[PDB]
Design a protein around this ligand. Structure first.
Ligand SMILES: Cc1cc(C#N)ccc1N1CCN(S(=O)(=O)N2CSC[C@@H]2C(=O)NO)CC1
Ligand SMILES: [Ca+2]
Ligand SMILES: [Ca+2]
Ligand SMILES: [Ca+2]
Ligand SMILES: [Zn+2]
Ligand SMILES: [Zn+2]
Length: 164
């Protein structure tokens, strides 16, 4: 099922920091903060890691909303298509998560994309999981909106393989 990145890339400290560098206008800031906090809460429960929001460009996981070419050479593509991408743990751009602001970001059913669910998938990459071949795993690479708990056994097995 689960996959890791070449060399089992992982964080080497337990207290992970994140910085929300900018905001989409799609949702109130506190709703965006909450969407990302809830996506981290999903991974903190099943790992020895903690996630603290800081205001610093030195944060481990830097979160951006961007359109088209947004600074890393992996451009976004307008509405639908590529939704978001994240880099595996490590320094600098590594571990960062970027969200295509040409998407309509929502919390709800079927009106564009759930920022909470997309962030939960991208944060799995930013902790060192790659794509799973197990259908219904959070890390299985297709978007389907769900009201159910997003983590599957295969995701939890993957993250336990990396962090214990
Ligand atoms: C797999 C997945 C699961 C959930 C949930 N729940 C929410 C979102 C989610 N994604 C978000 C990321 N995409 S994506 O933007 O289409 N995509 C497919 S390959 C490159 C890119 C990707 O995986 N980014 O991490 C596919 C599906
Ligand atoms: Ca980083
Ligand atoms: Ca897109
Ligand atoms: Ca948008
Ligand atoms: Zn990017
Ligand atoms: Zn992915």
């Amino acid at each position: 099922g689960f996959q890791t990145f070449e060399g089992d890339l992982k964080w080497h400290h337990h207290n992970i920091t994140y910085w929300i560098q900018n905001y989409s206008e799609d949702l109130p800031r506190a709703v965006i903060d909450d969407a990302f906090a809830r996506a981290f809460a999903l991974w903190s429960a099943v790992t020895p890691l903690t996630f603290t929001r800081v205001y610093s460009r030195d944060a481990d996981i830097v979160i951006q909303f961007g359109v088209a070419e947004h600074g890393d050479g992996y451009p976004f593509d307008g509405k639908d298509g590529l939704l978001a991408h994240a880099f595996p743990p490590g320094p600098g751009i590594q571990g960062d998560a970027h969200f295509d602001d040409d998407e309509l970001w929502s919390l709800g059913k079927g009106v564009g994309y759930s920022l909470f669910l997309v962030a939960a998938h991208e944060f799995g990459h930013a902790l060192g999981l790659d794509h799973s071949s197990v259908p219904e795993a959070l890390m299985y690479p297709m978007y389907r909106f769900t009201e159910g708990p997003p983590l599957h056994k295969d995701d939890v097995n993957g993250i336990r393989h990396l962090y214990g």
